[PDB]
Amino acid sequence: ATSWTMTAEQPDANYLTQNARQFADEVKAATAGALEIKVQSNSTLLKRPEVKRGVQQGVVQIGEVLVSALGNEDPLFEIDSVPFLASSFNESEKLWKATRPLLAQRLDKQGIVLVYGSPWPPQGIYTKKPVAALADLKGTRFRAYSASTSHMAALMGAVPTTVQTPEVPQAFSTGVIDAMLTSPATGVDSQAWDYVKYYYDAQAFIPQSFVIANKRAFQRLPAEVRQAVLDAGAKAEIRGWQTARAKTRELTDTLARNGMSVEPLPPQLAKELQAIGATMVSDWSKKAGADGQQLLDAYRK
Numbered sequence: 001a002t003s004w005t006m007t008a009e010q011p012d013a014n015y016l017t018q019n020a021r022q023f024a025d026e027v028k029a030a031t032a033g034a035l036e037i038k039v040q041s042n043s044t045l046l047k048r049p050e051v052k053r054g055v056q057q058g059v060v061q062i063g064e065v066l067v068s069a070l071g072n073e074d075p076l077f078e079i080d081s082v083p084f085l086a087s088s089f090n091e092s093e094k095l096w097k098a099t100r101p102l103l104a105q106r107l108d109k110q111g112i113v114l115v116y117g118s119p120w121p122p123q124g125i126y127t128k129k130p131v132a133a134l135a136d137l138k139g140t141r142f143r144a145y146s147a148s149t150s151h152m153a154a155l156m157g158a159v160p161t162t163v164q165t166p167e168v169p170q171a172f173s174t175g176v177i178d179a180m181l182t183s184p185a186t187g188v189d190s191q192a193w194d195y196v197k198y199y200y201d202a203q204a205f206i207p208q209s210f211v212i213a214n215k216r217a218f219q220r221l222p223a224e225v226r227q228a229v230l231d232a233g234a235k236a237e238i239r240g241w242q243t244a245r246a247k248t249r250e251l252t253d254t255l256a257r258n259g260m261s262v263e264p265l266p267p268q269l270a271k272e273l274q275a276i277g278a279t280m281v282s283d284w285s286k287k288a289g290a291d292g293q294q295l296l297d298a299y300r301k
């Protein structure tokens, strides 16, 4: 028998965390107890920027993390964060299908196995005051959570301030941040109605989360156990996509029930974020190589 420890980024409230828990449970049942994965969630073991290295170094054998957390190191890992490139689930899914094998190859070269992915819901904007154009956010201390969102915020004219998910309520309370961009899932997870008032259904992008394993640890399992992990992962990826699609509206309704103003994306903001998206995909294409171009070709196929 083998025991693994897994890190998961988000609290037990969060559906990606629940999907990882069910994945751990399904691995245990499918291997008849030969592999047990114990999940420590809410980034208490490793924080988002620490996950990849913790998995590589064997702090944990497996972990869940935002894909675009690897973006600074390798650009292919943040294509899911380019504004308005793939803002519907159907586009996101096609983008993911083109992105995944490239990521799996880039990770394998690093001693990491890509087990499965699942999407967050589309990213909206949360604010303390009404916003109708980028000007409203000029000089605003605006939460960033990745290299891509830091860059995006700067282009918006805001002052990017990196805050990891568990620290968001604190950061609002002490005035470190005054606005943010995130899904309605994080909005409900963190009960954001206590600290912000307006949510704009921007669908700026749909960032992926993935579950990645230490290759040496993975390779040491019996063949059948390795396959059970991959199959349980496949089921998790399907479950993850279905849940995100099924829950996006319920989560948005939850924000409104709890007194947030929930609004569609204002047209000037829509225009300006689209222009920001054009810049970023150009910026991205330059720093991605031919691998980048074959990804974009595959997507736009």
Ligand SMILES: O=C1CC[C@@H](C(=O)O)N1
Pocket: 066, 120, 121, 123, 145, 164, 165, 181, 182, 183, 184, 185, 186, 207
């Ligand atoms: O919807 C999302 C994307 C990343 C995560 C966060 O806010 O950090 N929640």
